[PDB]
């Protein structure tokens, strides 16, 4: 405990120093790391107070850019076994975060499903200690298209962590956060958005968000062509396609007036701008869906719909009260906990 | 890489194909397990089938994946069927975990077994008992007595216990240990007394465990006959000293009734000499 | 090492007996 800590720290200092003092590139210091990594291997259960991620970590970050150091998987996979599960849990949990990242960037999110299943097994740690876990976790769920779930996890990530390295970490989370609003199709206010991230960086997301709020396709295509790069950079490309659908879906919704008849022709004029002449087909899908609902006659060239003045006269507020009380109540129990 | 291509080959019916695939699979388990864990169920269908002869090999593989999943108990069950592809002293963590857990299974049964005739219960696993026989032998090679008695008490089997007691001069140290333990660990009478009773049989074969120890067990068990018989041989041999040691012990410790039966037998025989 | 095992067991049992009593004590005191 008292002797252990200087020996490890010397090793740790050894590693800081070799980067661009015994290297000039980020693949030459590595030779030196690998022989030193032995030490971790050597003592098994003669310790648990350690940090042992760093060596492997330096090697590992570089593979994330788009480089080939895929060897590292093999190495992390062995370590998850060395810790029993019932022994040396907190250190195992950290490792699992670094493996999960590596996998996320490149292919098969499916292997994460399993990782999650592992994650909930008897631990002496908590997976909310480093928020980064939530961030990775969120992308997984996002793909699967639970916009809500991803929102929770990301927002919890934002709590109790930025006020230092707020720089890089808030920007990555923040970019995904915006996208999730677009995906969910419910997009908040423009005032809010400014202050998150670095202002320069905020700008490409904002142009995209504005286009989607207007709900006009042509602008969405023009901006998107410019910003091929972001999606590429991030390592989440699939989003580029997914968003296309969303504009049209907002557009029908946007145009909700009032009267027992709206002319079909009227809807079609607004709609003309969104789509050449695929209008009725879209509309039909929309009504059927139950997001809005209506009756259409092409025969009399009118859409007939239902009227509402009966909000606050049925259960929709009842669900709200119940959900809202609950939030306050958990913290009220919590204050007492102290 | 994807595990999928390989995993599929087993789903196809052609027993050569399976066996080919199987050889690949046993090697690749550690790297792939996460992906393999979905597919476990089909692998098991093949193991259940006797229309496939590589049933023992399959079991071994399935089990490794359940260890990596974290279901030890389940892994064991398939593992007993593998049979002869179970091996001791390979000096692995996989092996250590399962032999340990086996003692525990035997323990799980003993409770139940106590309330029914004692030795073994009507449902037993011959295969499970066998791993335990092997564990003993393992431990005998080291020649450690302190370990030896710990396991025997703990697994709650008398038959193991008997074998263990060897040699003369180490045995009074060892017996003192066992005596304190049986009292202090067990507040369960049925078992606890049984071990003392097994121990008596052990005592007679030596010239002594301790002359005092021979008296103490009588006082615990309360068998007035047993004192009488031991005492009586002492008269004949003309061991005055051995005889006197008996009498101060019993007087102090025991009750009026206990004493009366013992004097009755003595008084018929004569004055002790 | 496996001789140790009974010795540890003794500690565990003791605590569970003590532990429950404390809950009970809390209730009584309230009243």
């Amino acid at each position: 405990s008292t002797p252990l800590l200087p020996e490890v720290e010397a090793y740790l200092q050894l590693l800081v120093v070799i980067f661009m003092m015994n290297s000039k590139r980020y693949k030459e210091a590595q030779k030196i790391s690998d022989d030193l990594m032995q030490k971790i291997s050597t003592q098994n259960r003669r310790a648990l107070d350690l940090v042992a991620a760093k060596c492997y970590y330096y090697h590992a970050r570089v593979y994330e850019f788009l480089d080939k150091l895929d060897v590292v998987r093999s190495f992390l996979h062995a370590r998850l076994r060395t810790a029993t599960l019932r022994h040396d849990a907190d250190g195992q949990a950290t490792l699992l975060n670094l493996l999960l990242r590596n996998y996320l960037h490149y292919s098969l999110y499916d292997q994460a499903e399993k990782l999650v299943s592992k994650s909930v097994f008897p631990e002496q740690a908590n997976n909310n200690e480093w928020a980064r876990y939530l961030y990775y976790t969120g992308r997984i769920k996002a793909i699967q298209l639970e916009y809500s779930e991803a929102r929770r996890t990301m927002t919890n990530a934002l709590r109790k962590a930025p006020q230092h390295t707020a720089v890089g970490f808030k920007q990555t989370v923040h970019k995904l956060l915006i996208v999730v609003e677009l995906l969910l199709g419910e997009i908040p206010d423009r005032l809010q958005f400014r202050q998150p991230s670095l202002k320069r960086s905020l700008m490409p997301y904002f142009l995209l968000t504005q286009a989607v709020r207007t709900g006009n396709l042509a602008k969405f295509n023009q901006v998107l062509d410019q910003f091929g790069e972001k999606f590429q950079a991030d390592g989440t490309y699939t989003l580029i396609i997914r968003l296309r659908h969303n504009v049209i879906k907002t557009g029908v919704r946007m145009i909700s007036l009032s009267y027992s008849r709206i002319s079909l022709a009227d809807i079609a004029q607004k709609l003309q701008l969104d789509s050449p002449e695929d209008a009725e087909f879209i509309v039909a899908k929309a009504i059927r869906d139950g997001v809005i609902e209506a009756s259409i006659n092409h025969e009399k060239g009118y859409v007939q719909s239902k009227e509402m003045i009966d909000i606050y006269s049925t259960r929709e507020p009842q669900l709200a009260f119940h959900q809202r009380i609950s939030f306050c109540l958990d913290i009220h129990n919590m204050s007492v906990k102290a | 890489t994807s595990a999928a291509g390989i995993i599929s080959l087993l789903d196809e019916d052609e027993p050569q194909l399976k066996e080919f695939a199987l050889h690949k699979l046993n090697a690749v388990v550690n790297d792939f397990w996460a992906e393999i864990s979905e597919s476990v169920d089909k692998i098991e269908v093949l193991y259940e089938d006797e229309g496939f002869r590589s049933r023992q090999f399959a079991a071994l593989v399935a089990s490794k994946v359940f260890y990596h999943l974290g279901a030890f108990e389940e892994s064991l069950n398939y593992a007993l069927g593998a049979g002869d592809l179970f091996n001791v002293n390979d000096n692995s963590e996989y092996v250590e975990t399962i032999i340990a857990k086996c003692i525990d299974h035997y323990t799980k049964q003993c409770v139940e077994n106590a309330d029914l005739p004692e030795g073994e219960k009507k449902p037993i696993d011959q295969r499970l008992e066998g791993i335990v026989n092997k564990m003993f032998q393992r431990c005998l090679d080291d020649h450690k007595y302190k370990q030896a008695i710990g396991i025997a008490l703990e697994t709650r089997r008398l038959d193991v216990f008997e074998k263990t007691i060897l040699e003369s001069n180490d045995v009074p140290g060892m017996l003192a240990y066992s005596l304190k333990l049986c009292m202090s660990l067990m507040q369960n009478k049925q078992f606890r007394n049984k071990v003392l009773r097994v121990l008596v049989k052990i005592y007679m074969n030596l010239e002594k465990p301790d002359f005092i120890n021979v008296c103490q067990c009588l006082i615990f068990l309360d068998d007035p006959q047993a004192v009488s018989d031991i005492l009586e041989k002492l008269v004949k041999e003309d061991n005055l000293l051995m005889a006197y040691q008996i009498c101060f012990d019993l007087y102090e410790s025991a009750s009026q009734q206990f004493l009366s039966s013992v004097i009755q037998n003595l008084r018929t025989v004569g004055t002790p000499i | 090492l496996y001789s140790r095992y009974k010795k540890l067991q003794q500690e565990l049992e003791f605590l569970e007996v003590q532990e429950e009593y404390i809950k009970d004590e809390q209730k009584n005191l309230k009243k």
Binding site: T84, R86, Q124 | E96, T97, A100 | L12, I22, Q26
Partner: peptide
């Protein structure tokens, strides 16, 4: 080997609860 160690962990954990819970009682 693992059995004595696992046994050892659970005692460590229980005691920290008991100390805490106890501390509320004295107060």
């Amino acid at each position: 080997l693992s059995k004595i160690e696992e046994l050892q962990l659970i005692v460590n954990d229980k005691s920290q609860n008991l100390r805490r819970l106890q501390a509320q009682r004295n107060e």
